[PDB]
Amino acid sequence: FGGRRAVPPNNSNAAEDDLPTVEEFLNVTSVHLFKERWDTNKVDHHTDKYENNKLIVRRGQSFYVQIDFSRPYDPRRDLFRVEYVIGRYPQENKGTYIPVPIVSELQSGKWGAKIVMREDRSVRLSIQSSPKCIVGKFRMYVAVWTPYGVLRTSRNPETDTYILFNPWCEDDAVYLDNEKEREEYVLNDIGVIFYGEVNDIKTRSWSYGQFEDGILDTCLYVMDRAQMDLSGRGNPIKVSRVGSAMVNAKDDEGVLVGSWDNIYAYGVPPSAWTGSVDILLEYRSSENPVRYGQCWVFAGVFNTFLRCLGIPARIVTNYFSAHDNDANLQMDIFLEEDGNVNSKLTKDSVWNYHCWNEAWMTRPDLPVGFGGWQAVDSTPQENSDGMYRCGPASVQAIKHGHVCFQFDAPFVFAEVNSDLIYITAKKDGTHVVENVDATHIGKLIVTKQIGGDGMMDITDTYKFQEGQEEERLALETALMYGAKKPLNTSNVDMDFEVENAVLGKDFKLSITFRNNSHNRYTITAYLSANITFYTGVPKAEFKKETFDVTLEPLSFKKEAVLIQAGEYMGQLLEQASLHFFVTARINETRDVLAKQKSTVLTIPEIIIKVRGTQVVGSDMTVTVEFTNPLKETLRNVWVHLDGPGVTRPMKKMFREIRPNSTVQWEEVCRPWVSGHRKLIASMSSDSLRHVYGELDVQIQR
Amino acid sequence: FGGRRAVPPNNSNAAEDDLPTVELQGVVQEFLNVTSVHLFKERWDTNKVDHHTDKYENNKLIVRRGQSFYVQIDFSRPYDPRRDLFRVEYVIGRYPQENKGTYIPVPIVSELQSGKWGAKIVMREDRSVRLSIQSSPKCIVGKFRMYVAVWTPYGVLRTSRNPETDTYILFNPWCEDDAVYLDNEKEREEYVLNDIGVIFYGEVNDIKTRSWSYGQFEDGILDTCLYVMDRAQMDLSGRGNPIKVSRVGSAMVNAKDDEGVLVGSWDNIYAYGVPPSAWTGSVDILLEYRSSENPVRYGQCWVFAGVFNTFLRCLGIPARIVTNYFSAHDNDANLQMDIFLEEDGNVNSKLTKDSVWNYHCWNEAWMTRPDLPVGFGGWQAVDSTPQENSDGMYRCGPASVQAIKHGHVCFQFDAPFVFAEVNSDLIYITAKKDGTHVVENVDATHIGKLIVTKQIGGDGMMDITDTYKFQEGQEEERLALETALMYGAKKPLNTSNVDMDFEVENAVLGKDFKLSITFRNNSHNRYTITAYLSANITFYTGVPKAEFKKETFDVTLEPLSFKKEAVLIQAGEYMGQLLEQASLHFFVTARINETRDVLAKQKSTVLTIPEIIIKVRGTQVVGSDMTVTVEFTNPLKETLRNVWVHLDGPGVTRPMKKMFREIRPNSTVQWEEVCRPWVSGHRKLIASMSSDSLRHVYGELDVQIQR
Ligand SMILES: [Ca+2]
Ligand SMILES: [Ca+2]
């Protein structure tokens, strides 16, 4: 017996029922959706880019259709309506079965088709869809009411209509108030990711490829995979919520398998990906998680998902990110009485950088003022529910400390608002808090700018200025709704700068000391440089050195060191990150001075060049060039080319590139998208990876 | 490499590292060696008795957080305050860290401190020292490993792994500084210490009760609750948060695929499991889940609630099961439940697919809510029976019950869904042949009409509907509804002087019964009505299987008057077609000809299934045999196949069952088991019977066990 619910869950846009064709009367002979990509419909609904041959409109906006009948429509003795249905169990009640009534005028916010033209046996309609409509692929019918039952059109796949989110419709939640932001955030399918570190910002390109053939369907499939209730697919919040939860593969469910293990044995290294396109297609193709991804990889894929559906989204990169924060606002560094970092206890690392997504939508479920951008982090960490993605959290609520409001705001708030606490763990077992640094985590938050590949600084959007009461107010409120501060809080200054260097080069480092006091100090400063993964996780202390300083009053003292390429070269991890600690305990006052900086060695680039003709439908030759400036023969050197609208993503491995050898790969491309495009490449050998390169090509036609 | 995190997640209590017995460092030996440790953990002693952990059938020390307990450390030679530094340590998981609260160095201290870990040397006698140890009231809940370490200036020396000193530390409803603190003893006794509950079912005009064995103190249960959290990979540093324990624990009750305690099923057949109706308590279910390490088949709402209540009370979180009569489950935050009518007034059963549950059970867990503004602490509603929430198909809660009452549903967790469970409106709507729809009437008095829970006294019912909602009609309720509507609650549609209602006689399974409809014409107009009656056989969830009786009649209402119409429902009309729980649903809709006005009303009835008989003889004394006698007399005129009888009674017997391949009509079987009670005072024997057909049959017997 089916005793839990009378009608089973309607959670698959792919499944379908069989609507009966029977429940001088007027019977339809043909249906015309003006669905060509040059036509009024797709152009005005901004769905002309999608490599799809079905009508694709946006909710909350009218589109035209033409019904042809057996004989002409006569208002005196005829009743018909268009219907759109979705899922295996459509129900009017649940918005999955939609009868579009014939209306005189179209009413703001309701489904309705108005008879706009009548010629011979044809009726032209202007159909308006509700602005809170379910997003998915709807099946279309025409039903004709007669006095025994209803007559309806037969399953016609050619008329299937996609109704997406509508940033342009001012009555949609997704309503984005500006045409420029809409092109970037919804219509632009090439993105830029910021990596490296706060004082050496790296940039790389990503093919979001949302208009590529098969991506929209994979986006619906991702939802059918989460068995998402069709009745909720029209809520951008729930779509963000359920959708981000599918990015990271929990087991053998989810799009991407996460792994920061530097080898990536049974799959593709995260550094290898050029875009979300092959990933998603691999997912749909295989129906199994795609190995492997990391933060920017999950964020690249999720941004594709959101934009592809019509919710404006962007990727954000925070500098010095307190992930796995557990909503605590203190990251600890343990010092010995000696002034030396205790590496046994000090086990919480800050990420050099951490990307997540931002989704634009209103938040009617919240006090007014909280719409706009909502932070969504597909990279799980412990939240109130367990090991899951976080969000959507209103960036505005996070900025103000109103972290009680869903979803997972205390975690995102702590991701950018934590302090570093320097603590002396004594030889007797006790702990003594030495110093607190309220300016390292979330030092710089960044995302691609609207009119170009540049970087826009968005730090002030997640939080206020350090010191002023606004930041102080946000802090005092957060503390009340989920944020935690478990521990309560000599005239010498220390500081130090490392120097950015090219992979394989030596580099300086300098420590400055300034004693504004009128007494002589003797100190013991210590340097500890570790090889780290981008997450801050340390692998090994490649350089350790002890400094003995003797400051004089009113003195400024600078000391220098040179890290030699050989001290790190056989040990670096992908991304080539290095971390530095300079801790200094004075002697006469037993006080500690501590500082840390990270650095990444600037890594090589791929050379992409073109020749031949650059016109849509026209062959141009593209050459992928890699000059390995290293002293090791590079094994299994996979190279990858992408370029949304110019080429699909492709890969070629070169058995081994020997020292200072350039290898070349030309690929004959035939664009399908005119205008400003971009060629994208990556390279991941068997050791050296996270090597990128791009080429901007102009395609004509 | 594992570049994700420096140290793996500490999310198993069962996992353990090896703490070194000597961890020195530097250069260059009798400093104090522990000879032995004495936790004074006997069940009759003061540690367990004062920590109210003495009922646990567990020979390890079990203590509640935030309250001092005593230990004695016998050294190798007399502690000498002058040179010896030492202290107790508590560690949990494979990756303990002071930071996360999983490695806990308890400092020897001059005076116990409020809400901090410390041990005060309360005695010194020949090598031995006695300590009064106090745990922080925010301590992680679980079973910890105990060590004793001696600080030497070059590293430390410490005890080796000793399973016998493993100490469980639980939530403490008796500690004023514990988030779980409950004021008076009567409540703690009830919501924490009582291991037998009562579940309410049936329908609002016919409340049924049955006993349920929580058995939180029975052998194996504490460890199983720790195992549930381990199977959910629950971060150990979150096991000290009752809000999180409730959130994660409930999510573990319902089995999604092959993770979870119980596979829910509502199909009336139960092919490869035990019918949800057969279970007598949580014990055998939690122990099966632990042995097999796979989901137990099967459960329904009250079963999920029973098992979750055990889980909660076992860890130390006060909890109770609540029953909501006429529950709007699967609401999607909509406060509107639809009934579609045809133009003539009849109910349209193809369009009416939403059903109201005769009743629905969930749990309440008591704790402060520091994450929410003041006033939302106390009972938190948590429902482990899934429904579509903001995240997906999952359990809902904990949701401040005070937030639901005031409609402050923006506050976590899933408050809009629980608010709608109790506040939906039934909307009668006519579906016309031309396809359009017209709204006739909204009945705002059906759903959440009675919310009940067992009394602190004994087995009686406590009406707690007022804790979930204000009185119908007055200001506080309109406001609460106003506030909710702006934070997640949804009403998708906008809303002749004849009244109508009807009563249905409760019958015993197999007997005729009557239904009586009354119409009140409060106007001066004379009307003509055509009323319809549709009686459906249904599941407790309201899902109908078949219309067993339909009747349509014409009435002529005189101005200002009452008019009754009585209907006889003969047994023969429903007998061969009931579903377990024997629910019946009646719709009575009428249509007034002159005005086109619609009158509509609904009622449910459950047929009363006779009890099982339990008898005992002999010595009802702890450690002495008494023979229990359960006998069931087949009420039906049909023969029963594979009749299973279950017997239970925490402290009196472990759950058990025997099968009868067949019980011919009017026959009687008897099962007798010799029980050697291990718990004294007022106990209870509980039984159930479930066969290939008749089922949802229970019984019990109260017993006083002497000492
Ligand atoms: Ca800060
Ligand atoms: Ca009500």
CSV table of N, CA, C and O in Angstrom, one decimal, chain B residues 335 406-407 419 475-487 489:
chain,number,residue,atom,x,y,z
B,335,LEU,N,0.4,27.2,4.8
B,335,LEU,CA,-0.6,27.1,5.9
B,335,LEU,C,-1.9,26.8,5.3
B,335,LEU,O,-2.9,27.1,5.9
B,406,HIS,N,5.0,32.3,18.8
B,406,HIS,CA,4.9,33.7,18.5
B,406,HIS,C,5.1,33.9,17.0
B,406,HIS,O,5.3,35.1,16.6
B,407,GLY,N,5.2,32.9,16.2
B,407,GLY,CA,5.4,33.0,14.8
B,407,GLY,C,6.8,33.6,14.4
B,407,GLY,O,7.0,34.1,13.3
B,419,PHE,N,5.7,25.2,12.5
B,419,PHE,CA,4.6,26.2,12.6
B,419,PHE,C,3.4,25.8,11.8
B,419,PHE,O,2.2,25.8,12.2
B,475,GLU,N,-6.0,38.4,19.6
B,475,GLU,CA,-4.8,39.1,19.1
B,475,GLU,C,-3.4,38.4,19.0
B,475,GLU,O,-2.7,38.6,18.0
B,476,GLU,N,-3.0,37.8,20.1
B,476,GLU,CA,-1.7,37.2,20.2
B,476,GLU,C,-1.5,36.2,19.0
B,476,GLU,O,-0.5,36.2,18.3
B,477,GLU,N,-2.6,35.5,18.6
B,477,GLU,CA,-2.6,34.5,17.5
B,477,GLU,C,-2.5,35.1,16.1
B,477,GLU,O,-1.9,34.6,15.2
B,478,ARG,N,-3.2,36.2,15.9
B,478,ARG,CA,-3.2,36.9,14.6
B,478,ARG,C,-1.9,37.5,14.4
B,478,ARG,O,-1.4,37.6,13.2
B,479,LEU,N,-1.3,38.1,15.5
B,479,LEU,CA,0.1,38.6,15.4
B,479,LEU,C,1.1,37.5,15.0
B,479,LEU,O,1.8,37.7,14.0
B,480,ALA,N,1.1,36.4,15.8
B,480,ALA,CA,2.0,35.3,15.6
B,480,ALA,C,1.9,34.9,14.1
B,480,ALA,O,2.9,34.6,13.5
B,481,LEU,N,0.7,34.9,13.6
B,481,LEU,CA,0.5,34.5,12.2
B,481,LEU,C,1.0,35.5,11.3
B,481,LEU,O,1.4,35.3,10.2
B,482,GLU,N,0.9,36.8,11.7
B,482,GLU,CA,1.3,37.9,10.9
B,482,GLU,C,2.8,37.9,10.8
B,482,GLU,O,3.4,37.9,9.7
B,483,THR,N,3.5,37.8,12.0
B,483,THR,CA,4.9,37.7,12.0
B,483,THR,C,5.5,36.5,11.2
B,483,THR,O,6.4,36.6,10.4
B,484,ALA,N,4.8,35.3,11.3
B,484,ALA,CA,5.3,34.1,10.6
B,484,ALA,C,5.3,34.3,9.1
B,484,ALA,O,6.2,34.0,8.4
B,485,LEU,N,4.2,34.9,8.6
B,485,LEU,CA,4.0,35.2,7.2
B,485,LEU,C,5.1,36.0,6.6
B,485,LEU,O,5.4,35.9,5.4
B,486,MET,N,5.8,36.7,7.4
B,486,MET,CA,6.9,37.5,6.9
B,486,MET,C,8.3,37.0,7.0
B,486,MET,O,9.3,37.6,6.6
B,487,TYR,N,8.3,35.8,7.6
B,487,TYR,CA,9.6,35.1,7.8
B,487,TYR,C,9.6,33.6,7.4
B,487,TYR,O,10.2,32.8,8.1
B,489,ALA,N,6.5,31.6,6.4
B,489,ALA,CA,5.2,31.0,6.4
B,489,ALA,C,4.5,31.5,5.2
B,489,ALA,O,4.5,32.6,4.9
